[PDB]
Design a protein around this ligand. Structure first.
Ligand SMILES: CCCCCCCCCCCCCCCCCC(=O)OC[C@H](COP(=O)([O-])OCC(O)COP(=O)([O-])OC[C@@H](COC(=O)CCCCCCCCCCCCCCCCC)OC(=O)CCCCCCCCCCCCCCCCC)OC(=O)CCCCCCCCCCCCCCCCC
Ligand SMILES: CCCCCCCCCCCCCCCCCC(=O)OC[C@H](COP(=O)([O-])OCC(O)COP(=O)([O-])OC[C@@H](COC(=O)CCCCCCCCCCCCCCCCC)OC(=O)CCCCCCCCCCCCCCCCC)OC(=O)CCCCCCCCCCCCCCCCC
Ligand SMILES: CCCCCCCCCCCCCCCCCC(=O)OC[C@H](COP(=O)([O-])OCC[N+](C)(C)C)OC(=O)CCCCCCCCCCCCCCCCC
Ligand SMILES: CCCCCCCCCCCCCCCCCC(=O)OC[C@H](COP(=O)(O)OCCN)OC(=O)CCCCCCCCCCCCCCCCC
Ligand SMILES: CCCCCCCCCCCCCCCCCC(=O)OC[C@H](COP(=O)(O)OCCN)OC(=O)CCCCCCCCCCCCCCCCC
Ligand SMILES: CCCCCCCCCCCCCCCCCC(=O)OC[C@H](COP(=O)(O)OCCN)OC(=O)CCCCCCCCCCCCCCCCC
Ligand SMILES: CCCCCCCCCCCCCCCCCC(=O)OC[C@H](COP(=O)(O)OCCN)OC(=O)CCCCCCCCCCCCCCCCC
Ligand SMILES: CCCCCCCCCCCCCCCCCC(=O)OC[C@H](COP(=O)(O)OCCN)OC(=O)CCCCCCCCCCCCCCCCC
Ligand SMILES: Nc1nc2c(ncn2[C@H]2C[C@H](O)[C@@H](COP(=O)(O)OP(=O)(O)OP(=O)(O)O)O2)c(=O)[nH]1
Ligand SMILES: [Mg+2]
Lengths: 459, 48, 63, 345, 120, 53, 320, 99
């Protein structure tokens, strides 16, 4: 893991020592090489786990998240290097440093073998995205969004720290494999119920669970494009990864303690899909779609079925890719028309045909068109939920119907229809942003071609 | 002469430069010597 | 290098972590026992110094 | 002040806590406290304004009353045991009076009402000298009698100190008052970990000192006493915004800053001693402390408040004010978390 | 808690028993990070004094790195001694009181009956 | 002058080589069960001295 | 800064280096009234350093290369624009007044540092004590507003009592029609567009506030033009002046030391001129402030500390 | 009013550089950034990385598990053994509690 961590660390001196006319080129190229290096974690020819060191290890669950982070860093640089052209050189290098630090800390968080180090890197990732949102956001409400994000996460994560220290005192090491082997069954008392809630509520906050999801739409709206990408594509999945890692020592009382959160997830995905149906802001629509998909992931992890875990992993990877792609397309329209209003730009299919093709493919990925990994994850989550209870199919079907409805509504109101001819400032297309859309869509196609990479721990 | 007033850092403070370089060299040399003596003392105490 | 390298590295890591866990639990028990009944090196609370007591003969013989 | 009286006053300020820490006798520890108070009063009132006069008067009467209660405890112990040290069997009333008087000298809640007011109205360097140097000697006295103290009263004092510090720092806009309520909260943490492990008390004290010193130095760069005054720092000293943000986040206890380490290890020791309720409440109020720190960061660094026209002339002028010891303390208070096993004992 | 141990020299930085310990390797991540912190301190000091960040004050940066490595080495040796004597005292107390630390017999997974909780 | 003006291109490869070296250091650090695993306990071939390096 | 407590202990005593001509003499008058020549001749034949009137570009000429910088760097205020349109809605008048007060404060700090360091006397033209006359003239003509006046008075209260007043204040009394005639003879088209009401407000502010307030603490030397326009009788009066009042009598070595430290720390001098009172005539905003600050930092010789700018010929940077 | 800079208007970048690629204002850095993004992103990552992942063998023991399953099926079918025993563990080595 050190062979990925060290050159990502060396990206920062490269950023601060490169010429201002060469910084973007050098950092983008070497981050692409970093991702190519990170692809060596897929060499898993055995049932064992690649425990590289005493503090770093690789997993069938951790590996796709690490590869996705390393792949998202150059895409974030390409996405963010347009709204920083009228910007100071040291501020540009600081922004690149923030993105690189996010990538480093997220790779270390996913490769961590010890839960206290996982929590330390959790908060370490909490810092620079707050800095990015607050400093390079556009509207006034970025400060309130950053406060909401930071303190939802902190109030979640403090009882997680208390619970981790308690489990460390009880067991001795807080090492993941040691806990997985010497797991003890809890006796289902009120203290154990509170311990369960303490170690689950941080991840449920960052997922986000319904009712506590209020930080996410304003944070994603007010964030810059790279911040929205890293948030919606890695940090929610970081919460899910924490849930999967910590759920192994919570038997058996997760069986009955999972009940309120499954109901919250299902009804919240219905409610947030309805909000997407009636939402006037494109980034808000994408954010609430992310809330619904992560609610599906929450329900799968709560029901703790091998099909549910596999569908959760596939939906994590697929939703990260398609949500970053949707945010990049919305940011292209935002850099064109300087607005986020859903209905303001309408006939963009006429002027931007290839970008309309990218929009259509992103939305078809969003509504889980087969045989994509989006549909793979959603279908296996549905199968596991129907095994858990046959009446969940009603909520699943309503969610699927509204999902297709808001995705096609987005397509029709942003691309189809008559062209808003007053928008004289419609530059044709940037090869940079078309490349960004291609670099989002192609890994979706390749993972659709070979879905065995992102199945996860259970299969 | 560019500046209208002579800067306090127009010329390098040679006493400070010599003292700092000598302190750095002395500390490195003393560090290496005490590390070698610590290695030798550890070997002599543990019979290695 | 092959699967045996990763297998035996995992065995070494697990041995190290299990020994560390057992040592931490033993350290907690040692600290608790010493704090309860201080008889080891740790938690030795102070005591007035014995060497500052007069033992010379004094004015009053009843000392 | 002529250099003769500067040397006398500063040497007595130094000598007070040194005598207190080196003294075996409770009476010599008390006269070290007297030395510290008497020597620090003239430098408090040195600016000779009405606010400085009020601050010096309030500080004098508070520390004098607390020192009289300390002397009462010492004399009662001498009456009971015939010695000049709380050895093992001194009365719990005597020990509680000692704890209460030392907490009033330290300035933790509910004895905290003077500390933001004394910190206001004095110059920034004297606020630094107060909030760092003046707390070492009472903490040394508390550390010397750690197994004798009452955990219930100590925990109550600690939890109300952290609560009132969080709320006061939330309300205040004056930088000196903000730093004083920060001192109250951190003193609450130190007192909370005092009866269980004084090594962690010393660790938290050292971390707080090395975090408080460069924050006060950065305030001393431009005499920024207000949120707005520190907010226009981007025009005056733009190179200090990152270190200001990092030090404020370290004061907030955010990982991976080294200021997360004292709160983390104090929580760990409390969990080892089974005070989970106290640890959780202290952690939530520490989150509130981090909130007012984050609002300060928003004001000074992440946003850019409007500047003045004379700031152009201030940029024309050049400064040599930030000393050599600023950056060392800032780095050691920012990026030292991986050396945590070395920082703890 | 270890200040009251027998044979404790007062205000002694490195007692002679620490000489039995193996010294730090002098190229180890703790001291390398200390030198990195010293270099970062020098760069930050240059930037705050409005000097060129890297090409100014080379003697100052060298002194910062050297002093950080020196102090870190001696402090690291002291902390290694402290942890070593902590483990020594712990093991000695365990050997002195074996009846308070009994060797528990862990049975195999054939005589214990773990309750099975079906997930369905 | 290419070495002077393009010296920044070696930092990331140097970090990669250093990371590979540190991974090798961790591999040779964790050798307490080298050819001692009950799954892979095999007799050494006469031309080799370790099972893996 | 070389001077400090250590240098004071080793011996840098101002009272040791004073003499009979270590005086601060401020020459004051109306807009065009014999003030530049009189101060020049007084300084020349008393062996004192002449400080001309602190203009807009005073800090630019005393820092860096000493060339006059661009106007957006130096205050963003124009005296010619004030003369053309005094009641302009952008707020040029009070911006000019506050900038000129800050420039006079910097010049007074420079003169005090020179006097306390070398012992040579200083002859200033229209120091900080005679700038509120322009402020009150602007206010009574309606050019600025009450909030501007309150902000000026707050800055003057924050800055003025930290220093020592001039030893001698020389005043030139020239009537308003004579000032108007001299302005016409000078021939500046912008300066010709001034009002006799504004000139009379300046003179009334002088006679009603400046002269008695300086009379209670220093020696006042009101002269007409004919007593002036001949800078030898004035010099003879200065020579036979007896300074027996004011706060200069009670000053000793350590008060002089602390004053010298204050006036040599220039950011400490200009600290209260940049109070965060958000008056719209003087507050700027983040975008314009960043643009102006970045342009000033990319100006030659201004990117780093003086002595560290390699583009202007600084050497031995790596050794300092 | 406060002396605030006016709103900057985004100019048509294609007006002065009709071959603009989205990366930088001057054409040379722009075209080299485009070439670097395409070459290091598509050519050597989306092709070589895809080939590497495609030629990772026996990924999580898929084909090994298939071959071992075939071998066990052949053995248990020619020896008359059950294909799967109902108990994974032998009941002889499990000590049940007495009551
Ligand atoms: C690299 C990373 C570390 C850099 C440290 C130094 C920072 C610095 O001075 O940067 C300036 C300087 C660049 O300045 P410049 O552009 O040249 O000119 C100065 C400007 O003109 C100055 O312009 P100005 O002053 O007029 O205005 C600028 C001002 C304007 O102010 C602002 O813009 C305000 C901005 C506010 C928002 C940011 C707040 C702070 C955020 C901090 C990070 C938080 C998130 C990260 C995660 C949590 C971290 C705790 O400031 C800035 O724009 C930012 C200044 C600081 C930038 C660098 C920050 C470094 C620390 C954070 C990143 C690294 C650590 C975290 C990640 C770790 C890995 C995951 O940076 C460098 O030169 C970096 C070093 C490059 C060379 C490295 C060589 C290494 C050699 C190793 C071998 C030799 C030593 C061997 C030792 C061992 C021997 C045994
Ligand atoms: C260019 C720059 C580097 C020049 C190096 C020149 C000297 C050289 O060649 O040294 C070879 C030397 C040979 O090593 P060795 O003695 O053979 O043992 C290596 C083994 O792997 C044994 O090493 P280990 O894996 O046992 O590590 C020792 C241990 C103890 O070592 C440490 O604690 C050092 C940690 C350095 C990071 O490390 C840890 O416990 C790692 C803690 C990780 C979690 C820390 C969480 C806090 C946040 C991240 C770190 C702080 C960054 C700044 C703040 C911003 C955060 C976003 O290599 C090193 O010293 C490795 C570290 C060098 C890079 C330091 C970080 C940059
Ligand atoms: C993001 C959501 C935030 C709020 C909900 C957080 C989780 C709620 C449920 C857990 C209780 C609170 C966290 C406790 C963390 C430690 C848990 C643990 O170790 O449990 C076992 C322990 C019990 O210890 P034990 O397990 O050793 O028990 C010993 C048992 N015998 C003797 C049989 C062996 O539980 C506790 O100690 C819990 C005490 C909590 C007291 C303080 C609660 C304060 C309020 C909490 C919420 C504050 C934030 C929100 C405010 C409002 C916002 C709108
Ligand atoms: C938001 C919606 C909340 C309400 C959802 C609907 C009711 C769910 C009730 C529930 O959680 O029942 C499960 C369990 C039943 O009780 P039982 O399994 O017998 O546990 C023994 C307890 N000593 O109940 C319990 O064990 C009692 C405690 C359950 C707490 C669940 C979380 C409550 C909300 C936290 C936020
Ligand atoms: C844990 C951390 C432990 C170490 C803490 C101290 C770190 C080093 C501090 C000393 C240092 O860096 O000094 C540099 C300074 C260089 O001097 P200079 O830059 O010329 O400044 C004089 C102004 N004309 O040097 C000096 O001023 C004195 C040089 C050494 C004299 C002996
Ligand atoms: C064991 C405990 C060790 C001590 C911990 C407590 C810190 C004690 C600090 C004592 C000195 C305080 C002092 O003198 O403060 C005033 C001074 C003002 O600094 P300044 O005005 O910039 O002076 C420049 C002139 N050369 O301020 C300073 O010079 C700042 C001093 C900061 C010292 C921080 C020490 C951290 C611990 C090592
Ligand atoms: C510059 C620093 C130079 C230090 C030289 C050596 C000082 C010394 O004698 O340190 C010993 C000191 C006390 O050692 P000890 O007898 O264990 O006392 C217990 C008190 N906590 O040991 C300690 O106080 C240990 C912790 C020292 C931390 C220093 C950096 C902060
Ligand atoms: C792992 C975590 C990843 C996280 C995100 C990473 C992003 C960065 C990615 C960088 C590059 C890494 C690519 C990773 C996927 C590699 C795909 C691949 O080559 O898979 C191998 C596969 C053959 O493998 P095989 O074992 O035969 O498959 C299972 C059968 N037992 O090979 C093939 O089958 C050949 C594939 C290439 C040939 C072209 C295929 C074109 C397919 C067109 C489909 C059209 C319909 C699409 C519909 C979509 C609807 C939305
Ligand atoms: N509004 C305003 N104008 C000022 C201020 N200070 C100086 N001025 C203007 C008045 C004149 O037009 C110009 C030059 O000032 P002087 O009094 O030195 O005039 P000048 O040199 O033309 O004549 P003189 O020195 O009297 O022989 O600067 C001030 O504070 N406010
Ligand atoms: Mg003139």
């Amino acid at each position: 893991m050190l062979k990925i961590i060290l050159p990502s660390l060396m990206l920062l001196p490269l950023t601060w020592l490169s010429s201002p006319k060469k910084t973007w080129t050098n950092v983008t190229s070497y981050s692409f090489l970093i991702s190519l290096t990170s692809l060596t974690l897929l060499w898993q020819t055995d049932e064992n786990y690649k425990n590289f060191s005493n503090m770093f290890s690789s997993d069938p669950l951790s590996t796709p998240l690490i590869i996705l982070t390393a792949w998202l860093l150059p895409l974030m640089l390409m996405a963010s290097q347009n709204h920083l052209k009228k910007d100071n050189n040291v501020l540009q290098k600081l922004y690149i440093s923030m993105l690189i630090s996010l990538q480093i800390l997220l790779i270390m968080t996913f490769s961590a073998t010890e839960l206290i180090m996982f929590y330390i890197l959790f908060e370490a990732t909490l810092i620079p995205t707050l800095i990015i949102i607050t400093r390079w956001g556009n509207q006034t409400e970025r400060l309130n969004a950053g406060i909401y994000f930071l303190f939802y996460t902190l109030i979640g994560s403090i009882p997680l720290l208390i619970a981790l220290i308690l489990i460390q005192n009880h067991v001795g090491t807080l090492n993941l494999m040691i806990l997985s082997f010497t797991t003890h069954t809890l006796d289902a008392s009120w203290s154990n119920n509170l311990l369960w809630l303490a170690c689950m509520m941080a991840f449920l906050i960052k997922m986000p669970l319904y009712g506590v999801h209020l930080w996410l739409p304003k944070a994603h709206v007010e964030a810059p494009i790279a911040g929205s990408m890293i948030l919606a594509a890695i940090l929610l999945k970081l919460g899910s990864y924490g849930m999967i890692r910590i759920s192994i020592i919570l038997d058996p009382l997760t069986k009955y303690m999972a009940y309120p959160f499954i109901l919250l997830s299902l009804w919240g995905m219905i409610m947030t899909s309805s909000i997407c149906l009636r939402q006037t802001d494109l980034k808000s629509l994408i954010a609430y779609s992310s809330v619904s998909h992560m609610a599906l992931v929450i329900a799968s992890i709560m029901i703790q079925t091998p099909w549910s875990f596999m569908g959760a992993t596939m939906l994590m990877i697929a939703h990260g890719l398609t949500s970053s792609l949707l945010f990049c397309l919305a940011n292209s329209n935002y850099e064109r028309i300087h607005s986020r209003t859903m209905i303001m730009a309408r006939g963009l299919q006429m002027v931007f045909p290839l970008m309309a093709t990218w929009w259509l493919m992103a939305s078809l990925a969003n509504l889980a068109l087969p045989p994509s990994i989006n549909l793979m994850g959603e279908l296996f989550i549905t199968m596991s939920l129907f095994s858990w209870s046959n009446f969940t199919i009603i909520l699943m079907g309503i969610n699927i119907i509204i999902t297709g409805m808001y995705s096609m509504y987005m397509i029709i109101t942003t691309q189809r229809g008559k062209l808003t001819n007053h928008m004289i400032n419609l530059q044709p297309s940037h090869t940079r942003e078309l490349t960004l859309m291609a670099l989002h869509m192609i890994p979706l196609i390749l993972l659709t071609t070979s879905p065995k990479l992102i199945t996860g721990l259970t299969m | 002469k560019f500046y209208v007033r002579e800067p306090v850092n127009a010329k390098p403070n040679w006493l400070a430069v010599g003292l700092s370089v000598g302190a750095s060299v002395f500390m490195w040399i003393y560090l290496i010597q005490t590390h070698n003596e610590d290695v030798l003392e550890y070997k002599r105490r543990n019979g290695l | 290098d092959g699967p045996e390298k990763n297998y035996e590295k995992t065995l070494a890591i697990l041995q190290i972590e299990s020994e560390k866990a057992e040592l931490r639990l033993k350290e907690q028990e040692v600290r608790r026992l010493m704090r309860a009944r201080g008889d080891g090196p740790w938690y030795q609370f102070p005591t007035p110094e014995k060497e500052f007591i007069d033992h010379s003969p004094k004015a009053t013989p009843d000392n | 002040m002529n250099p003769i009286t500067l040397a006398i006053i500063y040497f007595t300020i130094f000598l007070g806590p040194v005598i207190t820490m080196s003294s075996t006798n409770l009476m010599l520890m008390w006269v070290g406290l007297e030395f510290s108070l008497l020597a620090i009063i003239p430098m408090l009132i040195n600016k000779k304004n009405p606010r400085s006069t009020e601050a010096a008067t309030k500080y004098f009467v508070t520390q004098a009353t607390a020192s009289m209660i300390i002397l009462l405890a010492i004399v009662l112990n001498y009456k009971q045991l015939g010695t000049w040290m709380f050895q093992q069997q001194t009365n719990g009333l005597i020990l509680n009076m000692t704890l209460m008087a030392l907490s009033m000298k330290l300035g933790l809640a509910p004895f905290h009402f003077w500390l933001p007011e004394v910190t206001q109205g004095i110059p920034l360097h004297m606020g630094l000298i107060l909030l760092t140097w003046q707390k070492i000697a009472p903490l040394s006295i508390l550390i010397q009698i750690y197994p004798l103290l009452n955990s219930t009263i100590i925990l109550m004092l600690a939890i109300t100190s952290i609560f009132m510090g969080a709320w006061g720092g939330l309300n205040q806009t004056q930088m000196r008052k903000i730093m004083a309520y920060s001192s109250i909260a951190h003193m609450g943490w130190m007192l909370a970990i005092l009866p269980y492990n004084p090594s962690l008390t010393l660790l938290n004290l050292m971390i707080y000192i090395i975090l408080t010193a460069p924050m006060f130095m950065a305030l001393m760069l431009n005499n920024s006493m207000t949120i707005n005054s520190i907010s226009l720092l981007w025009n005056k000293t733009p190179a200090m915004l990152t270190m200001i943000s990092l030090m404020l986040l370290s004061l907030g206890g955010l990982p991976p800053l080294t200021g997360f380490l004292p709160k983390w290890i104090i929580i760990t020791e409390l969990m080892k001693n089974n005070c989970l309720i106290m640890a959780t409440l202290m952690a939530m109020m520490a989150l509130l402390n981090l909130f007012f720190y984050t609002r300060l960061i928003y004001s000074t660094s992440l946003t850019m408040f409007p500047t003045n026209n004379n700031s152009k002339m201030m940029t024309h002028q050049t400064k040599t004010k930030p000393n050599l010891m600023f950056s060392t303390l800032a780095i050691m208070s920012t990026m030292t978390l991986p050396l945590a096993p070395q920082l703890i004992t | 808690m270890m200040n009251g141990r027998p044979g404790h020299e007062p205000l002694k930085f490195l007692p002679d028993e620490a000489r039995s310990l193996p010294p730090p390797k002098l190229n180890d991540p703790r001291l390398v990070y200390m030198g990195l912190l010293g270099y970062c301190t020098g760069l930050m000091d240059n930037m705050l004094r409005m000097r060129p960040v890297m090409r100014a004050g080379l003697h100052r940066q060298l002194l910062f790195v050297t002093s950080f490595v020196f102090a870190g080495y001696f402090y690291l040796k002291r902390q290694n001694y402290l942890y070593a004597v902590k483990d020594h005292d712990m093991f000695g107390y365990i050997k002195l009181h074996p009846e308070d630390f009994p060797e528990k017999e862990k049975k195999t997974y054939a005589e214990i009956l773990e309750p099975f909780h079906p997930v369905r | 002058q290419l070495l002077r003006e393009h010296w920044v291109h070696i930092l990331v490869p140097a970090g990669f080589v250093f990371g590979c070296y540190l991974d090798r250091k961790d591999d040779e650090k964790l050798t307490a069960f080298r050819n001692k695993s009950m799954l892979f306990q095999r007799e050494l071939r006469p031309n080799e001295e370790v099972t893996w390096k | 800064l070389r001077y400090g407590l250590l240098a004071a202990i080793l011996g840098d005593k101002t009272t040791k280096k004073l003499h009979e001509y270590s005086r601060v003499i401020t020459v004051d008058g109306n807009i065009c009234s014999g003030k530049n020549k009189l101060a020049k001749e007084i300084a020349q034949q008393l062996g004192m350093k002449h400080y001309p009137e602190a203009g807009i570009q005073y800090s630019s000429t005393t820092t860096g290369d000493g060339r006059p910088l661009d106007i957006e760097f130096s205050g963003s205020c124009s005296l010619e624009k004030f003369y053309d349109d005094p009641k302009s809605n952008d707020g040029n008048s009070y911006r000019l007044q506050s900038w000129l007060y800050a420039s006079r404060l910097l010049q007074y700090a420079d003169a005090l540092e020179h006097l306390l360091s070398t012992g040579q006397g200083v002859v200033l033209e229209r120091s900080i004590y005679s700038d509120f006359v322009f402020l009150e003239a602007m206010y009574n003509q309606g050019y600025i507003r009450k909030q501007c006046v309150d902000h000026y008075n707050e800055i003057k209260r924050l800055t003025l009592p930290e220093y020592l007043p001039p030893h001698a204040v020389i005043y030139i009394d020239v009537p308003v029609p004579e000032v108007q005639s001299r302005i016409q003879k000078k021939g500046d088209p912008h300066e010709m567009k001034v009002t006799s009401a504004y000139l009379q407000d300046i003179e009334n502010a002088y006679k009603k506030t400046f002269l008695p307030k300086m009379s209670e603490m220093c020696e006042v030397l009101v002269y007409d033009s004919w007593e002036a326009e001949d800078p030898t009788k004035v010099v003879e009066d200065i020579e036979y002046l007896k300074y027996n009042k004011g706060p200069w009598l009670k000053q000793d070595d350590w008060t002089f030391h602390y004053l010298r430290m204050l006036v040599q720390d220039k950011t400490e001098v200009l600290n209260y001129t940049t109070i965060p009172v958000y008056l719209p005539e003087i507050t700027i905003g983040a975008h314009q402030g960043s643009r102006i600050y970045n342009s000033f930092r990319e100006l030659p010789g201004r990117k780093y500390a003086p002595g560290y700018n390699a583009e202007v010929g600084d050497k031995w940077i790596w050794l300092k | 009013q406060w002396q605030e800079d006016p709103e900057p208007e985004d100019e048509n970048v294609y007006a002065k550089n009709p071959d603009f690629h989205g990366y930088d204002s001057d054409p040379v850095v722009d075209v080299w950034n485009m070439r670097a993004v395409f070459f290091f992103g598509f050519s050597i990552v989306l092709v070589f990385g895809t080939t590497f992942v495609a030629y990772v063998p026996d990924y999580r023991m898929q084909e090994w598990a298939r071959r071992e399953a075939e071998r066990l099926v052949k053995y248990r079918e020619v020896n008359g053994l059950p294909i799967m025993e109902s108990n994974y563990f032998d009941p002889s080595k499990i000590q049940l509690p007495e009551d």
